[PDB]
Amino acid sequence: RPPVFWLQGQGCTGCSVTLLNSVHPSIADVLLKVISLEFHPTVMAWEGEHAIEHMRKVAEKFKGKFFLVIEGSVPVEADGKYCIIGEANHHEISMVDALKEFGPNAAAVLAVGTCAAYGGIPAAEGSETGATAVSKFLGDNGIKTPVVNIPGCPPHPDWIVGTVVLALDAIKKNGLEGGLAEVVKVLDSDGRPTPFFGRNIHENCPYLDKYDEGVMSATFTDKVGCRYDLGCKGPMTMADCFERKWNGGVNWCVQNAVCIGCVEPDFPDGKSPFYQA
């Protein structure tokens, strides 16, 4: 089971919580059978500098072979002080510092959630922390490690687990270098795996006939008409929610309300106002 470190920047822990909702494999099976989650601040047993030093000990031994998950954006303003993630030997560790430390040595970096993938809400208009997407931060700092974006606010658990499994299966078919190249091949131009993000919501929406006919709901609770006039961003959104749905298949955003385009690189500002077209 390959070692995984899960670092949280400017995240809300929603990307961790969504993962806990994985149905098959369950999160228990993910943690005991699929990955070795060596560092994760929300769930791990140890704490503080001991947890940081444990991650550093694993990283030293498994240099080039561990997977680094980033949840949340990386704020660069004020010398990184808007996100301090730990302290070891009286030296504070910012998210900037941590990504520069571990990023170069990971097999691959999985930018989980729209914040990590694209900046998201912490980077949106009115912010002032210099919130930066993982791939941009790494590129700006000359770090060439492969990045895979798994966006959504939050992502569906199946997108996170499925991307992990796709990468691990690819590595066991073609080795580390070969397998990472196979993964690159199934990424779209926004770095997203096409199994989950290759199809447009609207083109696959059950209300498409109503859109084409001009039949629009005027209240949220009218479930017959298309949701476009209520603000649905499905026409601009690439995700498979229409099929997989959410939380054990019990609902999804378009059925319940509207799609807000949460997986898209312009979320939230280019998807807002949410409740008009």
Binding site: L20, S26, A124, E125, S127, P154, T219, N247, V250
Partner: protein
């Protein structure tokens, strides 16, 4: 033994980024400082937006308690917009939000706190840990703890299915908006909610509440520490009618042995020890300002310091159960007698010392989970399948509104001011803000800082009780800072 400073960063098995620094002298904590180390600035991000967007944006404060923020936001918007939420939409909202209380408490006890007392399997992320972790449970009770941790992973996921039935998805519901709830409950989906609820209820009554008392009975010393100020706040939550006057949790303040009403005008947020501009200190939320100052000398946290009439108060399940003083659960009363020799009927029969303690906060959270079962059962009987749940109000040109509720971790309020049909100001005063804040402008510690005083550290190389105390308050630093 002498004097030792211990810094813990990150404090793990909480939500968010927290550093705790304590001074230990002669085996006990004698000073403490808590530092919320991550800032996003939702209060400035929200400015200039369509006010209806707030009930989506604000949920991203926190993916553990997004329904609490959604609720406070839509209540503020309802007031600002003049929207009259239909009765059935009020009940639907309560079903969406109540299901996440169950999720959050179960997550907290098992997946965040239980490893403080239970040794997990011999694999990451359950090892490595402190060599002397003070894990006292028998082989059989420890195995029960692990089995329940594993089962709880399924139970908390089912709670999120409950949230999503009428909320759309979780984390980050789509189903609450200004004016009500976006999806009318159908007969068929109410069957689905109730079937899941039955499974959750059975786990809460048969496993969770018993295990908290049973583990507690092996850590009876943990009822004798962590009192802090012994002062509590509740702002009220879960409207039970459409008049705004009866709630499942009723508001109140408790301090220095006295009960008093809650008056929100008495809230001020201080920033002397927080990374915000000095000129913004001491403001009530209706005039709140958020101007980061990450280089300000002497400050140590991105959490502001809220005070109620100058008082440093705590929030959360203990606060609500203390203020409201309901009857204890039948199983709790039985186990208090069987395992502790304690005769108790009402919550306050625990006594102030044992209630305001490390283990008392875990007990309070389990008892509150039980209490929520009856509320949700009531709402499932009260809801009418098929009855409309939303109105569609226009955006007002100029308005203000405040939403008050109780998030799983304690009191939450959102204040919005609308000008020219856009957000002019938006201020959040959240639960872990009340608990995990730094000193105020007078030098008075925050609630958890004060509760750390006296915590035993008999082994400075294995100072496990520092974070055990912190975890009892279920901190969420994403919420505290926003």
């Amino acid at each position: 033994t002498g004097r030792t400073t211990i810094a813990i960063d990150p404090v793990t098995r909480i939500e968010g980024h927290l550093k705790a620094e304590v001074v230990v002298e002669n085996g006990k904590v004698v000073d403490a400082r808590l530092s919320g180390g991550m800032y996003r600035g939702f209060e400035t991000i929200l400015r200039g937006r369509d006010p209806r967007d707030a009930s989506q944006i604000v949920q991203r404060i926190c993916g553990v308690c997004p329904t609490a923020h959604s609720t406070a936001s839509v209540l503020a918007l309802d007031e600002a917009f003049g929207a009259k939420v239909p009765n059935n939409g009020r009940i639907t909202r309560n079903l969406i939000f109540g299901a996440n209380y169950l999720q959050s408490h179960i997550l907290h006890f098992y997946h965040l706190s239980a490893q403080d007392f239970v040794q997990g399997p011999d694999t990451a992320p359950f090892v490595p840990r402190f060599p002397k972790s003070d894990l006292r449970l028998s082989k059989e009770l420890n195995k029960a703890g692990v089995d329940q941790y594993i089962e709880a992973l399924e139970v908390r996921r089912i709670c999120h299915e409950m949230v999503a039935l009428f909320g759309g998805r979780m984390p980050h519901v789509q189903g609450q908006v200004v004016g009500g709830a976006t999806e009318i409950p159908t007969k068929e989906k109410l069957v689905e909610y109730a079937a899941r609820f039955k499974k959750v209820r059975d786990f809460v009554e048969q496993k969770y509440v018993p295990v908290v008392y049973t583990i507690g009975s092996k850590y009876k010393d943990m009822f004798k520490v962590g009192q802090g100020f012994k002062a509590a706040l509740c702002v009220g939550a879960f409207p039970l009618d459409n008049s705004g006057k009866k709630h499942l949790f009723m508001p109140g303040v408790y301090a220095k042995g006295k009960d008093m009403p809650f008056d929100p005008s008495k809230i001020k947020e201080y920033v002397k020890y927080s990374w915000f501009a000095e000129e913004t200190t001491g403001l009530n939320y209706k005039e709140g300002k958020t101007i980061p100052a990450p280089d300000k000398a002497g400050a140590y946290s991105f959490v502001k310091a809220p005070r109620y009439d100058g008082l440093s108060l705590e929030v959360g399940p203990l606060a609500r159960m203390w203020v409201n003083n309901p009857e204890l659960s039948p199983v709790g009363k039985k186990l208090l007698k069987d395992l502790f020799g304690i005769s108790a009927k009402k919550f306050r029969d625990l006594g102030e010392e044992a209630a305001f303690s490390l283990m008392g906060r875990h007990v309070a959270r389990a008892e509150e989970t039980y209490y929520m079962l009856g509320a949700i059962e009531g709402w499932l009987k009260e809801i009418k399948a098929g009855e409309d749940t939303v109105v569609m109000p226009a955006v007002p040109a100029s308005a203000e509104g405040t939403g008050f509720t109780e998030a799983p971790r304690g009191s939450l309020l959102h204040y919005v001011k609308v000008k020219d049909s856009k957000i002019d100001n938006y201020q959040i005063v959240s639960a872990s803000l009340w608990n995990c804040n730094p000193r105020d402008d007078m030098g008075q510690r925050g609630a958890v800082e004060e509760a750390l005083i006296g915590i035993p550290v008999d082994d400075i190389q294995n100072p496990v009780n520092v974070a055990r105390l912190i975890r009892a308050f279920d901190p969420x630093l994403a919420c505290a800072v926003h």
